[PDB]
Design a binder for this molecule. Structure first.
Ligand code: SF4
Ligand code: SF4
Lengths: 144, 144
DNA sequence: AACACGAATATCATCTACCAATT
DNA sequence: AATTGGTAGATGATATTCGTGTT
């Protein structure tokens, strides 16, 4: 059981954008992707996703890059992981070869509850929490 | 975020073995794999794993198949999912391209706690619970 | 001088098949 | 008449790339 590199990459991007100095300069996607150490092209897809979600402002030209939106700073990590991962079932009951235990599986209820426990354990935290010490100092130091 | 078909397949096998009538006849791996609808060869690897864990008795010849061990009926689903999935991190921080936020990532602590919440939501249930109504009746009906 | 949107290419983690060795 | 242990082919999900179209 593992989170997509898409989701973790997008959260890296959100954190980098969250440590930015208030009104220093908008960040180009390349510089964020290189600071957090991910391929630029994957980061750009994550940026388009985050922009659709409303957490990241992506100025498109004439001077301008990436800004953390008001929303971006107060949204919870649980909501972000739900929207970036897609809350898809933790098991593929109705795949190409569906399980005969559909419609009367207590394991499916159990795994439903466990996945909700995961997401709810993420639900309190915001992105400002994720960039508190010692993470914030590290991200800032990494800009050189 | 998805559970391996190995783990879900093995839990299907455990459930099928749990509904077996007390001293009816030991189950061949083929008949279990076909009742629960998984490829036989994958099921055999899961069976070897379960036997190493001590939950499944696999008589090797001269007449004999699969039995749920005393342990098998009282073990928790959380323990089973831990041993079959391997408690590997839900993110690959030290992969081929390690994250620069190792050693000072609050997201890693958050995801650690969320994964523990998952496993602990599974920790109460046993395998006898998973085959209670309506699952047990369905598994039994499926034997024809 | 950047971000967005859609079509492949690559990759790798697991799904799966298989042969030989017991028993 | 079955289960076990090591070896690759299969696969499909996603990690990644890229070209064109805005802006
Ligand atoms: S055993 Fe239950 S939870 Fe697992 S794949 Fe089948 S229906 Fe889904
Ligand atoms: S951002 Fe944190 S949790 Fe994510 S891969 Fe990097 S160190 Fe791990």
């Amino acid at each position: 059981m593992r989170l997509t590199k898409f989701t973790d990459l997008a959260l890296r991007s959100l954190m980098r954008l969250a440590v930015v100095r208030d009104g220093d300069e908008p960040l180009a996607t390349r510089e964020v992707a290189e600071v957090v150490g991910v391929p630029y092209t994957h980061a750009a897809k994550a940026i388009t996703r985050l922009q659709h979600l409303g957490v990241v402002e992506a100025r498109r030209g004439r001077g301008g890059g990436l800004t953390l939106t008001d929303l971006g700073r107060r949204v919870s990590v649980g909501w972000l992981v739900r929207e970036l991962e897609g809350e898809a079932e933790v098991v593929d009951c109705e795949g190409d070869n569906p399980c005969p235990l559909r419609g009367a599986c207590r394991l499916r209820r159990a795994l439903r509850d466990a996945q909700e426990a995961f997401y709810a354990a993420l639900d309190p935290l915001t992105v400002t929490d994720l960039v508190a010490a010692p993470t914030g100092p590290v991200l800032l130091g990494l800009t050189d």
